[PDB]
Amino acid sequence: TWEVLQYKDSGEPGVLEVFVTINGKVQNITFHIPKTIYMKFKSQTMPLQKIKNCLIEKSSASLPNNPKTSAGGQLFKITLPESVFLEEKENCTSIFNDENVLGVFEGTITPHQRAIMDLGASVTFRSKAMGALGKGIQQGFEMKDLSMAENERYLSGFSMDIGYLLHFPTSIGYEFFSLFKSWGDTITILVLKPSNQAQEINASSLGQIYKQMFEKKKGKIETYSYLVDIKEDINFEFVYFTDISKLYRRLSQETTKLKEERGLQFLLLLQSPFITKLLGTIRLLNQMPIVKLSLNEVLLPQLNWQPTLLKKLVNHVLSSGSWISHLIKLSQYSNIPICNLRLDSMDYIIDVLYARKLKKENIVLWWNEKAPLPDHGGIQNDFDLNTSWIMNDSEFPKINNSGVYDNVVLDVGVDNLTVNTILTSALINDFVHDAFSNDALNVLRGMLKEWWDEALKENSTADLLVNSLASWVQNPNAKLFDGLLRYHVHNLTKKALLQLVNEFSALGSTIVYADRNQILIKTNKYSPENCYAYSQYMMKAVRTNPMFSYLDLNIKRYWDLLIWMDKFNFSGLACIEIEEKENQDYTAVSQWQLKKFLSPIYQPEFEDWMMIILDSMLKTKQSYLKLNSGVENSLNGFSHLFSKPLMKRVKKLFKNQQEFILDPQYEADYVIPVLPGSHLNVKNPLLELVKSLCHVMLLSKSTILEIRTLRKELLKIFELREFAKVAEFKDPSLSLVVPDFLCEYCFFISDIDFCKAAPESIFSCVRCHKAFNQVLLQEHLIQKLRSDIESYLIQDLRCSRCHKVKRDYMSAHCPCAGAWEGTLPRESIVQKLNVFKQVAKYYGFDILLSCIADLTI
């Protein structure tokens, strides 16, 4: 057999350089593959006058249905070599520059990725009719000579040494090159410095770093030490430069000597942020077969970074082997060459396996490499309101029900929601212009069923595919990012969440909050000790449901007595696990973002009174339950317990308010803070505190009369009426949400709110607690701003009276004689842009500040 290591792009059209192995020897062979395109014509007639060496056939496959074309023609499949494709590219009399052209599907497919899809990682030749194999060796091999082979024999075991090269960029501006020899006994480090006055010599410290990690990673190397490396005890060499120009020449000599050390029988693990510039600067690596991993930029301080960076170098050197074995295990199932697959981006294997099944099912790909838009026959890059609506709108409708709850409020975490949604598409549904092609979605649904069935056999590769499909769909970087596909999955996710709400409501349980992961529901029970078996019965009954059988529902927290506003404003009493305890190991959680819109003297008093409110509510609920058991809830009459201290406390606070607000010594405690969500202006801080307390007490649907009388009595001391303009409550945070921002580590797809969340939970993941870079956050705010601006500029105009959409595109007024007004308000966009300016001024997004600067000019 011929197991393939690397498919390699070349400067020649249609010619690729292929590195395979035979008997442990790395063979390099030039390969010629013609390109196949799909051509849509105006009519059924074929004008083919004289075209040199081209196969033109009729094709029976439907097309990706973009909404602007959803005539009397036929699809045709044309195979021709890429060089002669360039020969009739320049001829305007050819069929490729015809005026009867409707579309050119799959015209941008490279020979490299086509050879990846068609031939797999295991290729064999056919010798039924072959004059000379050597004539095929220098003259190249055609695809009619080749076919697939067995996947398991691919990289069973290689007796071949690795060459490990890393580039380190630092935050202080230093540059590092490192070269490893498994056959040699040297690790070589090239270090750049701006000046020779800066000191970084740590050879004895590097030896001590190696001695520190030696016992630490001895137990970790030994899992794969019998295959990937011979001797782990090698010596350290270093060289220093103050410039970069001769540093390329030194690296070129030190990498050229590897070629004479081994003789073209080793692969290179290359990890640098720059690849094309690297292969431009140094030459012999370009012919060399390379496995690639894009490396994160190392962020290091000005001093004491040196043991950290040497620790990192030893960590990569001693942890390369498990990564290499994981590449082998990935390539065993993925049927992709080890050099050509990207381990760092999991979407490539998803795209090529998907496109393999698409090509198996006789349907035209929308494989587009160098643009997130699909091919769609080449009639893309044209604006349409349909594709702008289904590609622009990313909004997950949360179901929020504010109030106080005395039932055992259950927190369930929903995992694989997107996967369980897209897998059971045949059960959710139990000419459309904005619909994805149905047969391709049947292909993906069956493929995900196969992946899920293989995942139960503990295939970690298939586990990684089924956990990475949800990130593959959302990613525009992938080759098959189709907006119709993503809108199909998002709309089906909305439908599946609403059906989950209906299924939980059919068991006598009303939800509190619904989201992609966290769902809070209200049961019929009062105590969790009576509610545990009922909760288990409920979750097993919804796991029994046919539409939800792949949904990972796990209980996160039991809530006994809860106050709900949204996910960012909740307080109450909770327990993680149920226990046989009289106190039940209860804890009190208060997460008010309302507290931050208050003066610093008045912030802890809000938490104090919330604690008093919570304790009085538990005491009233316990007394009512003990009295009654032996429409209004258990909480009626709870404010008789603490209104008498609260009136006196408000009057004393009012007396303190009328003394020290204007005094410059105590005014620093009385200031209002500036927050990115803040849009209101406070007039009396005690009035705002009283409004916030009476509004959180006002969320009770049962005792709203008594709370209203308490608010009426409390508003008398400020000399305000019951229903004043300033007495009513408004939310002091305007909601700025970015949709579906996912971490690369734990793949948790969440919507990040930049106004109502704490700064600690914004820049890092919610569960993984790994910090995002600020650059992509800035980029996503630019995307959200331009999405809102684009949604303003493409806009229907409606009547002020008829409320009818504008059909005749340019007219003075409607037949109902009402004026034209925008569907979006005139003030909504400028409040959105003002909140963007405020959040840019707060969090210091200088790119977003520059965007506002160029937007105003």
Add this chain to the structure above:
Amino acid sequence: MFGSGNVLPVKIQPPLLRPLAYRVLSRKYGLSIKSDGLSALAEFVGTNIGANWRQGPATIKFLEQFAAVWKQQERGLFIDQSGVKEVIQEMKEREKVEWSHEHPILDWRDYFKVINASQQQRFSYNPHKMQFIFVPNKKQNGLGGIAGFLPDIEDKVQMFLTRYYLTNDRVMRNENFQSSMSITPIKNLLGRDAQNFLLLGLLNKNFKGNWSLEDPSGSVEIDISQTIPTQGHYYVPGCMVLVEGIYYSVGNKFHVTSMTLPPGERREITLETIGNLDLLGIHGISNNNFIARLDKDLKIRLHLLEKELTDHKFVILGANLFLDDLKIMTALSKILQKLNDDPPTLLIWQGSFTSVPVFASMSSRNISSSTQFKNNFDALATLLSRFDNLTENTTMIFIPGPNDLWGSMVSLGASGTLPQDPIPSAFTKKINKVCKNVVWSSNPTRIAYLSQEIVIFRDDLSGRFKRHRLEFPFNLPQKVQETRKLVKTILDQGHLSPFLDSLRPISWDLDHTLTLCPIPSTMVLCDTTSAQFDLTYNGCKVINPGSFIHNRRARYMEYVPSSKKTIQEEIYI
């Protein structure tokens, strides 16, 4: 310039200028003098004269000239210190021309300017006032959030009717309709059974999916079975076309015999119809009370000095040049060395600067795509640091491509809003540390070079025109023929992109830039889907380089404006 003064300047004051202020120009010519303008006049008389300001007749003659010049512009009844500065600079130019008249022996930088789509003055037509009217810019007015990128809600309604009445004026001015038939508004047609009518209509597809013609008075459905279209033209939805045919009242349909576009008019015809309005603002700026008038003698003098300057060249690269490709980098280095042999006047750089669209990726370990854009501009500045002659003697103009950072952030490389804004300044600051004078302009760019108005536009016109062309049942080199069809369609519309709003949106407040009611003398459409060409039509020059690479060759242009001549030069890469 001015006459030489022998003695040194002194700082004379507004005191003791009091008899020599109100009598000489405020009574003889009627111009009130403010304090700051009087102080600036005292400073300039001091610097011109010296100690003989008390008994010098040159002061009195200079103040009479000041009052006379303020009478030709009539910029205000008062006298402003900034107004004194503008009049002094115009006098320096004026006596520079007069010194060149005395001895036959200005500057091109004094009159050359660059206008983005945001900086262009707004004009709107009114047939209740029967002419044009200028609208002051609202970018300064109000909050910058309100002013920037938030147009008024009526402007979407007003945009296509403004284009309609402009097209109606351009077809009513032609000799064919001052002769053959007359244009009837569409609303009058329903009721006239079986009578022949000629129309101007916005071509549209209605909600029913049939073809329709629309005016501000209404619309009618048409059918295109019996049409005989005029050969040599392009028909796309969004065209305002002349339609001749018979209306039938049975099914409310209009049977079209022939269809054509309205005929074009030359540039000087449009300027004499408007009355020589300085639309770009080559002399000052237009205000609310007074509109800026382009002087005829000034235009003749600029044409004369334009014919005097013959060595000025405009080097135009082929569009769609990718900064990330190394072969493009090498070819750009070679052609910039060839331009380092002789630096031109302007080097207009354009095209989609990156191959991939810049999107919000999900690879936090790697450098971002915007970081890739910034690094590519830094590498461009590093290459531009090698060539001193281009950064010393040649200004450069940057036109955005369809795939640049700023516009295609949400469009993701697709068609977006038509007035594409310039590349952000924060992403390219090192270029501003290299070039002496670099202007980052919008996608429709109006540069005024002396008496010449030049429009730069980067758009893939021919692919969209061929894809949505009007197909008919009843219906010479090919590239030249399609070239003449494209240029004749674009000049007969008087619009850069005459598509519907569904095909390509236009931001509402800035459509007058894309409206080409003043036909420019020379514009450069940059269409990579079409081949390179150079034609003149209706007194306009339309030139096109296409893509940057065409079979291992880098294509560029040398356009001289004095003889109005373009040399097409290719470089074998």
